[PDB]
Amino acid sequence: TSKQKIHKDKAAEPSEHEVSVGQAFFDLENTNQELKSELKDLYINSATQIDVSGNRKAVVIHVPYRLRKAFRKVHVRLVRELEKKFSGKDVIFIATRRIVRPPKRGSAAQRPRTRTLTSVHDAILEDLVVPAEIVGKRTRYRVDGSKIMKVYLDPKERNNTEYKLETFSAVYRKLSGKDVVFEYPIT
RNA sequence: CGCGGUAAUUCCAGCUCCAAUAGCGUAAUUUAAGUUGUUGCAGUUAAAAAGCUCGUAGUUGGACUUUG
Ligand SMILES: [K+]
Ligand SMILES: [Mg+2]
Ligand SMILES: [Mg+2]
Ligand SMILES: [Mg+2]
Ligand SMILES: [Mg+2]
Ligand SMILES: [Mg+2]
Ligand SMILES: [Mg+2]
Ligand SMILES: [Mg+2]
Known about the structure:
InterPro entries: Ribosomal_eS7, Ribosomal_eS7_CS. By secondary structure, this protein is of the alpha/beta class. The protein has helices spanning 16-31, 36-39, 68-73, 75-85, 117-128, 165-176; strands at residues 46-51, 57-63, 89-95, 134-141, 147-153, 179-183. The chain has one domain (1-187). It has six helices and six strands. The strands form two sheets. It has a three-stranded mixed beta sheet. Strands 4-5-6 form a three-stranded mixed beta sheet. Helix 5 packs antiparallel against helix 6. The longest helix has 16 residues, at 16-31.
C-alpha cells in the first residue's frame, strides 16, 4: 500500500529513492495522530535529491496540481516530520506543471498563459519559499553577461526559511537554470 | 552693386596687361537650393498656429507568452 502514495506519470516504476519517500510518507499517515486525517488523501508523483553544498542534500518532492492547495495547510508540520526521518536534508514541495512550447508562426492553436515558461518558473519560485511570501523581485544584469535575480521574502516567516536560503537557491537553479539569492527587507 | 555733372581705374580710343585658346562671347534646364527640406528647412517678434471645441476617413498607438 506504500506504493499507493506515489502516482508517477505514465504509470512508471518508482525508483529506489521514491519508494523510500513514499514509504516514509506512509509511516507518518498512521504513526502521527495529528497528521492521520490530512495525509489520507495526499499523494505524490516524484521525488529527487539535489546536492546543495558541503555534502548536503535536498529532497524535492513534486505534488499533483490538484493537491497543491491541500499540502499547504499541512506544509509546515509535514516538513518537520519528514526532515527528521530524512536527517540532514530539506524537504521542498512543488506542484507539477506543464510548459507548453509557444505555437509556430501562423498557428491558430492557442496556449493558456499558465502554461508559459515564464508563468511556470514564477509559480515554482512561489512554491519553493513556502511559507515565506515574496514581497519583491530584482534582476541584475551584470556587465559580463550573466544575470542574477534577488527575491525579497516577508520577514514574518524568517525563522522557517532563514536556514533554507541555500537550498532554495540550489533547488531553483536545477529546476529553472537561473541564479537567485534571497533576502529579507529591513522592517 | 554702380560709372559718367571738365583732373573718368568703369564710356570712346591707343598702349600695356589678364583669362581661356582653335576656340570664345550672347540669348530652356541641372547645380549652387538645407530658398520645397523623406534624408533635411520654417511658423513668440523676420512670411507663417485655424477664435474655440467636437468629430468620420487618414495617420499613429503601453506592457506581457521559450529562456537557460
Ligand atoms: K544631411
Ligand atoms: Mg582721361
Ligand atoms: Mg567692369
Ligand atoms: Mg526661393
Ligand atoms: Mg527659409
Ligand atoms: Mg509686423
Ligand atoms: Mg509675422
Ligand atoms: Mg506595442
